[PDB]
Structures are given as structure tokens and as C-alpha cells.
Design a protein around this ligand. Structure first.
Ligand code: CL
Length: 403
């Protein structure tokens, strides 16, 4: 059917707003099972009123339209962000015009990102940054605790625990891209494929960071996970968590590993990276995704230190690679043995010099390539993604053959 907003009370003072779509939201590998999705927003209305995670651009208008019918937006005290991107920032522009009094609650990386993304918006709501073990009291026992859970794709990711309701707001962790009528997750098997596919696409290339996150989240006695996507996780909570533990262990235990180092200004090269990673992991080879824009030098040395191959993905910005890709290249060249398999991909518009530069440097430095250098003009399509996944598989097979 058409996009809607499903509203449901879920705990004391707590309501979920699920923006639902039965169609494919984006051309991203994670939407591949084509079972639709939801973007979940949450409202805690106590002595103070907090809204978690307004949905992105496809959902902006239905969401604001629905929300104003339920809430006087001038009474909104807080907008809490589990993560930040241009997609979400679009909704925030409208929402914060209507709720000029509200304070933004988010992680420090999310904050810098938001400040960038809203540089030319007129909105100037204040931001309160939260780090681990910070609190925010909404009254009536809802003393929230914050838990940064960063990953290469979501550097600003922030989880939130509400002890009054025993809900852990988990943002991108523990979700599933599936649109259904059930607000809650009764039944294990119907969601099992979606949950594993979600893990495989989003989390497997960030296994060390995701393990670290789950380690922190164990300290909170959650009875429910309230994720960005899919049903709320109540009936499948323990089972899903044990499966995560097992899947993470599998990932970090595979004999071969690929360092996939990328950057992306508008998301295109990132979309390609996800696809290539999935082709690699589905072939039984681990991926350590590195977002060069947010990573540090020791991160890269470490990744290159344990990898059997490395792959660079880069956009072209004024005819050059982004600065973080240039510096990552140096660390890589300074540390990688010439026996590592090499790959190059990227998206571009008018020109793709960054790709050419990287291919040349790696060839000159005597590396063997595991797939033909990938060049995508502007926005990736379904076909593009499948080709990239197949390249990742190809890369993986080439590594396995080498032992
Ligand atoms: Cl983020």
C-alpha cells in the first residue's frame, strides 16, 4: 500500500511512530530482500517531552503532519538523535522550525555532523552533547542514560536506556528492514532471515565496533530493544542477542580479512562500499570497513596489519581524492606488504581523477588487483550494486585461492 505512520503506545509515557513503506526505500544493498521497511520514531512524554529520531526525507511530510495532530510541537523539550545524516537532517529542518524551543540531544560526532549539515539552515536550536554515562531526566522515573556506539557508517551513533520502561533505544543495532502490521516481534522464524541479512549488510563489516557496543549495552537490563527499523524487539530479544554474539564471533574468526577503506561526500561511494563488502563477507572473508573521514592512523595501521587484501573507495572532489583518502593512502603504502591483494572503486560526476590516482599509485607500488577498478557515474542502481557485490565475491575468491 502507500507509506503511512503507524502509532502505538509501547510503555508508560512512551509511544512509537513507525513510518512505514512497503516499497524499496533506497538503492542500498540492505534493502535487497525488498520486504519494505519502517523508520521508527519514539516519544517519551513525561515531565519533559523527548522525541527520538524523526524519519528521513521520504517520510518528512507524513511524519510532521501526523505528529502535529498528536503533539503541540511548541511543548517538545528534546529531539534525541541516535544517528545523523543528510537524510535525517532534512526532516529536522522542518521539525525544528516548528519546535524552535527544543534542544537537540546527540553524540559528539553526530553534533559536528549536524552542524555541518545544517550550516545554511536557519534553525539554531541548541545542541546538548552526550557521552557515555551522561543522563537526561524526563521526570516520572525516565532518567535516560546514553551510550555512544560508533561504527564506520554511523560515527555519531548513540543508544539510550530508559530505566522506567526497561527500553533500550538501539538505533541501527538489532533492527530489520521489514514492513509489517505487527508493532512487536512475536514469532522468531518470520523475522529470522531479515535480521541476519540486516546484520550481514550493516554490521558484519564493523564487527569489532558492534561487539564493543554490545559489550556496553549488556550493562543495562533491557526488556525491549527499540530500533530504527522493523518491529520492536521484545519476544526475540534474548535469542536475537545470542545470535548477534554468535554472528560477531563467526565474523572475527574467519581466516582472511579485507581492509575496506573508503570516504564519501554525498553517500554514493559509501553505497558502493556496502555492496562490495557484502560480496566479500558472503564469500566467507571478513571485512574491516574503515571510514577514512572518521578513522585514526592506528585504526588504519591495525586493519592493514591484519588484512590479506585492502580496497580503497574514493569520490572526486575538485579533481582530487578527499584529504582523508590521501593520508590513508600514505599509511597503507607505508605498511602493506606487496603481497596484499588490492582493489579500487568510486563514484563520480564530471570526473573521476581520484580513482585513477589510486589505481596508478597502487600499480606503481607493485600491488596485484583483485578486480577491475570500479567506476560508477553518479547514482548507483540495482544493477550497479549487484555488479559490486559480485566484484567483492570475486575479490574474496581470489584471496582464498592465494591461501
Ligand atoms: Cl551517525
Amino acid at each position: 500500500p502507500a507509506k503511512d505512520v503507524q502509532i502505538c503506545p509501547i510503555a508508560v509515557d512512551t509511544t512509537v511512530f513507525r513510518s512505514r513503506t512497503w516499497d524499496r526505500l533506497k538503492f542500498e544493498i540492505e534493502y535487497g530482500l525488498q520486504r519494505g521497511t519502517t523508520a521508527n520514531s519514539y516519544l517519551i512524554s513525561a515531565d519533559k517531552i523527548a522525541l527520538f529520531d524523526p524519519p528521513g526525507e521520504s517520510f518528512t511530510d507524513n511524519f510532521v503532519g501526523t505528529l502535529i495532530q498528536r503533539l503541540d510541537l511548541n511543548s517538545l523539550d528534546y529531539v534525541i538523535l541516535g544517528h545523523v545524516n543528510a537524510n535525517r537532517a532534512h526532516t529536522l529542518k522542518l521539525l525544528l522550525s516548528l519546535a524552535p524551543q527544543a534542544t537537540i540531544i546527540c553524540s559528539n560526532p553526530a553534533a559536528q555532523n549536524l552542524e555541518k549539515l545544517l550550516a545554511d539552515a536557519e534553525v539554531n536550536n541548541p545542541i546538548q552533547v552526550m557521552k557515555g554515562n551522561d543522563h537526561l531526566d524526563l521526570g516520572r522515573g525516565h532518567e535516560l542514560t546514553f551510550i555512544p556506539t560508533p561504527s564506520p557508517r554511523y560515527p555519531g551513533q548513540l543508544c539510550t536506556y530508559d530505566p522506567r520502561t526497561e527500553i533500550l533505544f538501539t538505533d541501527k543495532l538489532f533492527g530489520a528492514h521489514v514492513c509489517g502490521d505487527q508493532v512487536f516481534d512475536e514469532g522468531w522464524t518470520i523475522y529470522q532471515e531479515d535480521r541476519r541479512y540486516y546484520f550481514d549488510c550493516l554490521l558484519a563489516p564493523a564487527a569489532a565496533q558492534v561487539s564493543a557496543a554490545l559489550n556496553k549495552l549488556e550493562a543495562y537490563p533491557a526488556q525491549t530493544y527499540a530500533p530504527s527499523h522493523g518491529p520492536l524487539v521484545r519476544y526475540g530479544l534474548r535469542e536475537l542477542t545470542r545470535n548477534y554474539q554468535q554472528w560477531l564471533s563467526e565474523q572475527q574468526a574467519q581466516a582472511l580479512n579485507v581492509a575496506l577503506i573508503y570516504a564519501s561526500a554525498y553517500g554514493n561511494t559509501s553505497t558502493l562500499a556496502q555492496a562490495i563488502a557484502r560480496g566479500i563477507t558472503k564469500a566467507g572473508v571478513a571485512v574491516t570497513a574503515i571510514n577514512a573521514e572518521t578513522s585514526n592512523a592506528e585504526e588504519i595501521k591495525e586493519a592493514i596489519g591484519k588484512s590479506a587484501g585492502f580496497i580503497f573507495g574514493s569520490p572526486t572532489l575538485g579533481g582530487h581524492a578527499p584529504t582523508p583518502i590521501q593520508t590513508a593512502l600514505g599509511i597503507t603504502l607505508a605498511n602493506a606488504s606487496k603481497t596484499q591483494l588490492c582493489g579500487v572503486f568510486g563514484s563520480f560526476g564530471w570526473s573521476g581523477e581520484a580513482i585513477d590516482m589510486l589505481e596508478n599509485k597502487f600499480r606503481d607500488a607493485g600491488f596485484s588487483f583483485g578486480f577491475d577498478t570500479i567506476r560508477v557515474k553518479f547514482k548507483p542502481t540495482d544493477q550497479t550494486l549487484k555488479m559490486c557485490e559480485e566484484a567483492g565475491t570475486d575479490f574474496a575468491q581470489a584471496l582464498k585461492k592465494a591461501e
